[PDB]
Amino acid sequence: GSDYEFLKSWTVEDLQKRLLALDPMMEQEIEEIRQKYQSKRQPILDAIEAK
Amino acid sequence: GSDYEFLKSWTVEDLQKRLLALDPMMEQEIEEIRQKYQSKRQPILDAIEAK
């Protein structure tokens, strides 16, 4: 529970720091999932390729 | 604690089920994050665009 509607009153420097930080926020989460599920998908490809 | 190495002896159907299920599985894990962060990004843009 936290709201960001008050960003309208924050300095350009404080809000900019959230915008740039928003990039590695979604990136880390996505890359990790892409890798983790790739780990789970890998043996599946390896299996069908061996039948 | 869930191994999927035994997949080498699965039927093409049992194996393929995991492969195809893997498609919407990652898609939903990622889109949830894209949606979530885009909602948090939206007010950040609005704030700088108002300065």
Chain B positions in Cβ-Cβ contact with residue A22 (cut-off 8 Å): 37, 40-41, 44
Token representation of residue A40: 């789970």
Nearest-angstrom CA–CA distance, B44 and A18: 7
Cα–Cα dist A49/B37, whole Å: 37
**At residue A8, what is the residue type?**
K
Q: Which of B23, B11, B37 is nearest to A26 (CA)?
A: B37
Which residues of A fall within a CB distance of 8 Å from B41? 19, 22
Domain count for chain B, please give it.
1
- Secondary structure (3-state) at A39: helix
Distances (CA, A) of B23 to A40, B17, B28: 12, 10, 9
Contacts of A44 (CB under 8 A, 6+ apart): B4, B7, B15, B18, B19, B22
d(CA B7, CA A43): 7
Here the tokens at position B30 are 């990622």
Q: Decide if B25 touches A, using CB distance below 8 A.
A: yes
Q: Can you give the residue range of the structural domain that contains B17?
A: 1-51
Q: How far is CA B3 from CA A3, A28, B7, B37, in A?
A: 41, 25, 9, 32
The CATH number for A39's domain is: 4.10.170.10
C-alpha pair distances (Å), B37 with each of A5, A10, A29, A45, B33? 14, 19, 11, 32, 6
Give the determination technique.
Answer: NMR
Of A12, A25, A48, the CB nearest to B48: A12
